[PDB]
Every structure is written in C-alpha cells, then in structure tokens.
Design an enzyme around this catalytic site. Structure first.
Site, PDB file in Angstrom:
ATOM      1  N   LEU A   1      13.181   1.285   5.423  1.00  0.00           N
ATOM      2  CA  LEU A   1      12.136   0.570   4.711  1.00  0.00           C
ATOM      3  C   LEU A   1      10.763   0.860   5.307  1.00  0.00           C
ATOM      4  CD1 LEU A   1      13.949  -2.861   4.434  1.00  0.00           C
ATOM      5  CD2 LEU A   1      14.032  -0.908   2.876  1.00  0.00           C
TER       6      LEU A   1
ATOM      7  N   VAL B   1       8.760  -0.704   8.706  1.00  0.00           N
ATOM      8  CA  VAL B   1       9.663  -0.879   9.831  1.00  0.00           C
ATOM      9  C   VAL B   1       9.715   0.426  10.606  1.00  0.00           C
ATOM     10  CG1 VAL B   1      11.986  -1.427  10.577  1.00  0.00           C
ATOM     11  CG2 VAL B   1      11.039  -2.488   8.519  1.00  0.00           C
TER      12      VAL B   1
ATOM     13  N   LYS C   1      14.379  -3.820  18.006  1.00  0.00           N
ATOM     14  CA  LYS C   1      14.438  -5.266  18.120  1.00  0.00           C
ATOM     15  C   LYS C   1      15.494  -5.855  17.193  1.00  0.00           C
ATOM     16  CE  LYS C   1       9.800  -6.230  19.920  1.00  0.00           C
ATOM     17  NZ  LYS C   1       9.588  -4.840  20.432  1.00  0.00           N
TER      18      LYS C   1
ATOM     19  N   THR D   1      -3.114 -23.674  17.876  1.00  0.00           N
ATOM     20  CA  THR D   1      -3.570 -22.956  16.682  1.00  0.00           C
ATOM     21  C   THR D   1      -2.984 -23.531  15.387  1.00  0.00           C
ATOM     22  OG1 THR D   1      -1.828 -21.257  16.890  1.00  0.00           O
ATOM     23  CG2 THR D   1      -3.953 -20.794  17.923  1.00  0.00           C
TER      24      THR D   1
ATOM     25  N   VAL E   1      -3.327 -26.482  14.471  1.00  0.00           N
ATOM     26  CA  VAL E   1      -4.302 -27.441  13.969  1.00  0.00           C
ATOM     27  C   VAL E   1      -5.320 -26.676  13.127  1.00  0.00           C
ATOM     28  CG1 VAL E   1      -6.141 -29.025  14.594  1.00  0.00           C
ATOM     29  CG2 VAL E   1      -4.035 -28.955  15.940  1.00  0.00           C
TER      30      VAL E   1
ATOM     31  N   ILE F   1      -8.531 -24.701  14.447  1.00  0.00           N
ATOM     32  CA  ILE F   1      -8.379 -24.191  15.802  1.00  0.00           C
ATOM     33  C   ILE F   1      -7.744 -22.813  15.685  1.00  0.00           C
ATOM     34  CG2 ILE F   1      -7.240 -24.399  18.039  1.00  0.00           C
ATOM     35  CD1 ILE F   1      -7.203 -27.364  17.779  1.00  0.00           C
TER      36      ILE F   1
ATOM     37  N   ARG G   1       5.530 -29.789   3.020  1.00  0.00           N
ATOM     38  CA  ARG G   1       5.482 -28.986   1.799  1.00  0.00           C
ATOM     39  C   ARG G   1       5.144 -29.907   0.634  1.00  0.00           C
ATOM     40  NH1 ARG G   1       5.401 -23.721   2.216  1.00  0.00           N
ATOM     41  NH2 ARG G   1       6.310 -23.631   0.106  1.00  0.00           N
TER      42      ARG G   1
ATOM     43  N   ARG H   1       2.532 -18.764  -9.114  1.00  0.00           N
ATOM     44  CA  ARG H   1       3.622 -17.817  -8.925  1.00  0.00           C
ATOM     45  C   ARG H   1       4.984 -18.465  -9.188  1.00  0.00           C
ATOM     46  NH1 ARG H   1       1.070 -16.831  -3.976  1.00  0.00           N
ATOM     47  NH2 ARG H   1       3.024 -17.211  -2.827  1.00  0.00           N
TER      48      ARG H   1
ATOM     49  N   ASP I   1      -4.498 -24.796  -4.722  1.00  0.00           N
ATOM     50  CA  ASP I   1      -5.577 -23.841  -4.884  1.00  0.00           C
ATOM     51  C   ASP I   1      -6.067 -23.909  -6.320  1.00  0.00           C
ATOM     52  OD1 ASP I   1      -5.431 -22.558  -2.199  1.00  0.00           O
ATOM     53  OD2 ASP I   1      -3.438 -21.970  -2.898  1.00  0.00           O
TER      54      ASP I   1
HETATM   55  N1  LIG Z   1      -7.451 -10.886  -0.293  1.00  0.00           N
HETATM   56  C1  LIG Z   1      -6.905 -11.952   0.334  1.00  0.00           C
HETATM   57  N2  LIG Z   1      -6.534 -13.000  -0.378  1.00  0.00           N
HETATM   58  C2  LIG Z   1      -6.052 -13.991   0.399  1.00  0.00           C
HETATM   59  C3  LIG Z   1      -5.911 -14.026   1.772  1.00  0.00           C
HETATM   60  N3  LIG Z   1      -5.388 -15.244   2.183  1.00  0.00           N
HETATM   61  C4  LIG Z   1      -5.204 -15.906   1.071  1.00  0.00           C
HETATM   62  N4  LIG Z   1      -5.567 -15.194  -0.048  1.00  0.00           N
HETATM   63  C5  LIG Z   1      -5.427 -15.589  -1.447  1.00  0.00           C
HETATM   64  C6  LIG Z   1      -4.018 -15.335  -1.990  1.00  0.00           C
HETATM   65  C7  LIG Z   1      -3.374 -16.703  -1.876  1.00  0.00           C
HETATM   66  O1  LIG Z   1      -2.323 -16.876  -2.831  1.00  0.00           O
HETATM   67  C8  LIG Z   1      -4.548 -17.614  -2.201  1.00  0.00           C
HETATM   68  C9  LIG Z   1      -4.409 -19.039  -1.721  1.00  0.00           C
HETATM   69  O2  LIG Z   1      -4.251 -19.077  -0.305  1.00  0.00           O
HETATM   70  P1  LIG Z   1      -2.991 -19.807   0.352  1.00  0.00           P
HETATM   71  O3  LIG Z   1      -3.123 -19.663   1.827  1.00  0.00           O
HETATM   72  O4  LIG Z   1      -2.939 -21.164  -0.235  1.00  0.00           O
HETATM   73  O5  LIG Z   1      -1.765 -19.060  -0.131  1.00  0.00           O
HETATM   74  P2  LIG Z   1      -0.717 -19.447  -1.152  1.00  0.00           P
HETATM   75  O6  LIG Z   1      -1.116 -20.592  -2.005  1.00  0.00           O
HETATM   76  O7  LIG Z   1      -0.266 -18.180  -1.794  1.00  0.00           O
HETATM   77  C10 LIG Z   1       0.776 -20.007  -0.166  1.00  0.00           C
HETATM   78  F1  LIG Z   1       0.691 -19.431   1.072  1.00  0.00           F
HETATM   79  F2  LIG Z   1       1.889 -19.526  -0.797  1.00  0.00           F
HETATM   80  P3  LIG Z   1       0.906 -21.870   0.053  1.00  0.00           P
HETATM   81  O8  LIG Z   1       1.685 -22.114   1.304  1.00  0.00           O
HETATM   82  O9  LIG Z   1      -0.457 -22.450  -0.079  1.00  0.00           O
HETATM   83  O10 LIG Z   1       1.732 -22.315  -1.095  1.00  0.00           O
HETATM   84  O11 LIG Z   1      -5.666 -16.990  -1.545  1.00  0.00           O
HETATM   85  C11 LIG Z   1      -6.280 -12.886   2.524  1.00  0.00           C
HETATM   86  O12 LIG Z   1      -6.193 -12.710   3.745  1.00  0.00           O
HETATM   87  N5  LIG Z   1      -6.783 -11.875   1.707  1.00  0.00           N
HETATM   88 MG   LIG Z   2      -2.034 -22.297  -1.319  1.00  0.00          MG
HETATM   89 NA    NA Z   3      -5.341 -23.188  13.167  1.00  0.00          NA
HETATM   90 NA    NA Z   4      10.385   2.958   8.018  1.00  0.00          NA
HETATM   91 NA    NA Z   5      -5.071 -22.640  -0.007  1.00  0.00          NA
END
Ligand SMILES: Nc1nc2c(ncn2[C@H]2C[C@H](O)[C@@H](COP(=O)(O)OP(=O)(O)C(F)(F)P(=O)(O)O)O2)c(=O)[nH]1
Ligand SMILES: [Mg+2]
Ligand code: NA
Ligand code: NA
Ligand code: NA
Ligand SMILES: [Cl-]
Ligand SMILES: [Cl-]
Ligand SMILES: [Cl-]
Ligand SMILES: [Cl-]
Length: 326
Positions: free
Chosen positions: A53, A56, A63, A92, A94, A97, A140, A174, A183
């Site tokens: 894959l 990896v 590991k 972290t 929190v 943080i 959750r 999703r 969100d």
């Molecule tokens: N381009 C990027 N887009 C990013 C990044 N972090 C979040 N996102 C986007 C996509 C998430 O769905 C969306 C909401 O950010 P979130 O952290 O809420 O993710 P999700 O809702 O998908 C989840 F992790 F599944 P949850 O536990 O909340 O159910 O923001 C990033 O680093 N780069």
């Molecule tokens: Mg979210």
């Molecule tokens: Na944090």
């Molecule tokens: Na590989």
């Molecule tokens: Na979010």
DNA sequence: CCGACCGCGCATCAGC
DNA sequence: GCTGATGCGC
DNA sequence: GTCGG
C-alpha cells in the site's frame, strides 16, 4: 476495525510525532499510513503485505510485523512510560493547547488537569474554554443530536435573513452516524468574491444563536470564521446535553462549491486531493481552483458550478461525500 | 540521493 | 497603530 | 516517514 490494532498504533505514533517531537511531516506520514490501511479490505497478515500500500514504507512495515507478532510496539511502550511525553500528549488534548504551549507548561510544572485548573490565570481565552469543557469536547455527537442542532441553526438563521443558506458539513455531510463537532457553512447573497454589500453578516447569525442560548461560548471570532461552543436545550427535569464545539464559516456565495468541498472533508481527503491537484497542475483552496503557470504561480480562478467540476479538472472520478472519509 | 509534504482564518506577539 | 512570524485549529 | 524523478 478490521485492522484496528494496527491503525490505532499508527495514530498513537502520529500523535507522538506531532505533540512531543513536533515533527509534522512524520505526523502526516503516520496518518496517511493509518488511513490507507483503515480502508484496506483485508485483515493484514504481514508488514510486507502492508508495504504494498502507498504510504507504508519500510519503517512502518517493520513496526507492523512487531505488532502482529507481539501485539504491541516497544517504541510506544516506552513513550507511555516517559513522564514528559505523557504529560505533553495529555495537555495537548485541551483545545487551544498545542505542542509548544504543552511543552512550555510542563517546563513550569503544570502537567495535570488539576494543575491547569489552579493556573487558569496562565491560560489565554481559548485555552480557558477548552479546559472548562474538557470532558464534554471528548464526547461524540450522535447523528440524532446533529439533526436537532441542524434544525435549530437553519431555523434561527432563516429568522435573521431568509437569504442566508446554512449547510452542515464535516462528517455529518459525509453521512457519519456520530460526529466530533458541528461544522456549518454559511452564505449570503450580499457577500461574494466581488463585494461585501453588508457588514456583520457572520456577527448577526452568531448574535442570534447566542440570543436563543444555543451558542454558549466563543473560542475565536472574525469576519468569516466563528469558532465556539454550543448546546442543545434539555427539557424539564432531564440532564442537560454536553456542550459541543461549533465552527461557522462564511464563504463568498459565488464560491460555494469550493467551500462546501473544503468543509465536507475529510482533512486527510482534502490533503490528498489538493496534493493530486498540484500534480495535475492546479492548486485548490476553499475559494477556488486555479491552474499553475509554467512559472509555478497560480493563475485566474477556473469556472466551477458543482463539486464535480472540481473533480473533473484534476481528472478524478467524482466521489460522493460518504466516500471521502479518509 | 533529496526535496517535498494543502491551504488558510484568528489570536498573539515582537519590532518598528 | 502597523506588518510579519508564529501558534493553533479547521 | 514515505514518495518520486
Ligand atoms: N484543507 C484542509 N481542510 C481541513 C483541515 N482540517 C479540517 N479541514 C476541513 C475538512 C473537515 O471535514 C472540516 C471540518 O473539520 P473537522 O475537524 O470538524 O473535521 P470533520 O468534521 O471531518 C471530523 F473530524 F470528522 P469530526 O470529528 O468533527 O466529526 O474542515 C486541514 O488540515 N486542511
Ligand atoms: Mg467536524
Ligand atoms: Na490541543
Ligand atoms: Na508502500
Ligand atoms: Na470542526
Ligand atoms: Cl517532520
Ligand atoms: Cl503498543
Ligand atoms: Cl466554487
Ligand atoms: Cl483564491
């Protein structure tokens, strides 16, 4: 959970690199491995099988053999035994943080929840709220509650201005049966890439949601991005719901598809897609998709009229929201 | 090798 | 006050 | 830590 043992290990390793080592690339390397393996439709039998894959390499293959053989990883066993690592990883957790602040607090002797609580004076606003709702934010959100929350938000928004359009994205869009937070993508016809004919557009909504006691706290707030806390109302005599993290993003109306694409995620899915985009000669952000000139500089925004147009530009078959959970 | 690893909003800070 | 870098988070 | 050129 077919390869739950393996993926949990990689995630724990990912968190260690990010939080303690402050090695963001190692962090993402582990995450990608976890993700591609989580999606693997077979119960992995060896590191070699796993190395086939993409994401990896040799190190992770080794590991995995250790894990399959012993059911654990010595590297992690030691990390767990290390007090500093343990303290930094915890802190972290929190909201507000990060790796730096965590390491700094440990340097000052603040290593526990108890410590954080008696040292509120040393925490910025965001960190203070993160601590206050430490327990809750770890819970959750059942989709049933997400549905009630959506109802409140859309109806309250409609009350402010019939022209606002609020879309719940993230894992909810999703199809997830449970989410980590809520969100919300917001749009108004008076706010486009062309102009902002009305100020306080996000403020108004935030204000209305605070009025009805839905939004309870604010982590950060700007012209286009609100990050705070919310709580569903409980009936008479029933225990109240846990407080939840809520993010609201105001995006130019004309740039909705790039916006909903970005906010639907996942974060890893976005990283993969944006990377693929580059490889195909484009750059994608939450506003537009632009081509990369011979020089390597972004060009003018390309016309977009559906999420699929974006997928077509980079020659990727369209993937429904439910299939972007990487 | 060895360079690249997505892209950006808000809070905070140092330096002017 | 301004700009720019850094932390943090999405 | 992993990948491609
Ligand atoms: N381009 C990027 N887009 C990013 C990044 N972090 C979040 N996102 C986007 C996509 C998430 O769905 C969306 C909401 O950010 P979130 O952290 O809420 O993710 P999700 O809702 O998908 C989840 F992790 F599944 P949850 O536990 O909340 O159910 O923001 C990033 O680093 N780069
Ligand atoms: Mg979210
Ligand atoms: Na944090
Ligand atoms: Na590989
Ligand atoms: Na979010
Ligand atoms: Cl790194
Ligand atoms: Cl382990
Ligand atoms: Cl768009
Ligand atoms: Cl743009």
């Amino acid at each position: 959970t077919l390869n739950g043992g393996i993926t949990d290990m990689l995630t724990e390793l990912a968190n260690f690199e990010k939080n303690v080592s402050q090695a963001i690339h190692k962090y993402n390397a582990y995450r990608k491995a976890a993700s591609v393996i989580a999606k693997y439709p077979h119960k992995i039998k060896s590191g070699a099988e796993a190395k086939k894959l993409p994401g990896v390499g040799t190190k992770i293959a080794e590991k995995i053999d250790e894990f399959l053989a012993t059911g654990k990883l010595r590297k992690l066993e030691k990390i767990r035994q290390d007090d500093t690592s343990s303290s930094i990883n915890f802190l972290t957790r929190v909201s507000g943080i990060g790796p730096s602040a965590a390491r700094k607090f440990v340097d000052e002797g603040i290593k526990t929840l108890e410590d954080l609580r008696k040292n509120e004076d040393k925490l910025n606003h965001h960190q203070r709220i993160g601590l206050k709702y430490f327990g809750d934010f770890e819970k959750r959100i059942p989709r049933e509650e997400m549905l009630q929350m959506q109802d409140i938000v859309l109806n309250e928004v409609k009350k402010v201005d019939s022209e606002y359009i609020a879309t719940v994205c993230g894992s909810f869009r999703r199809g997830a049966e449970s989410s980590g937070d809520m969100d919300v993508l917001l749009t108004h016809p008076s706010f486009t890439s062309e102009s902002t004919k009305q100020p306080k557009l996000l403020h108004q909504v935030v204000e209305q949601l605070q009025k009805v006691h839905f939004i309870t706290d604010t982590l950060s707030k700007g012209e286009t991005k609100f990050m705070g806390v919310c709580q569903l109302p409980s009936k008479n005599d029933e225990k109240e719901y846990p407080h939840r993290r809520i993010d609201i993003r105001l995006i130019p109306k004309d740039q909705y598809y790039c916006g909903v694409l970005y906010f639907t995620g996942s974060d890893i899915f976005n990283k993969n897609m944006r990377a693929h985009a580059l490889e195909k000669g484009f750059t994608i952000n939450e506003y537009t998709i632009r081509p990369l000139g011979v020089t390597g500089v972004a060009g003018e925004p390309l016309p977009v009229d559906s999420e699929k147009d974006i997928f077509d530009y980079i020659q990727w078959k369209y993937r429904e929201p439910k299939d972007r959970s990487e």
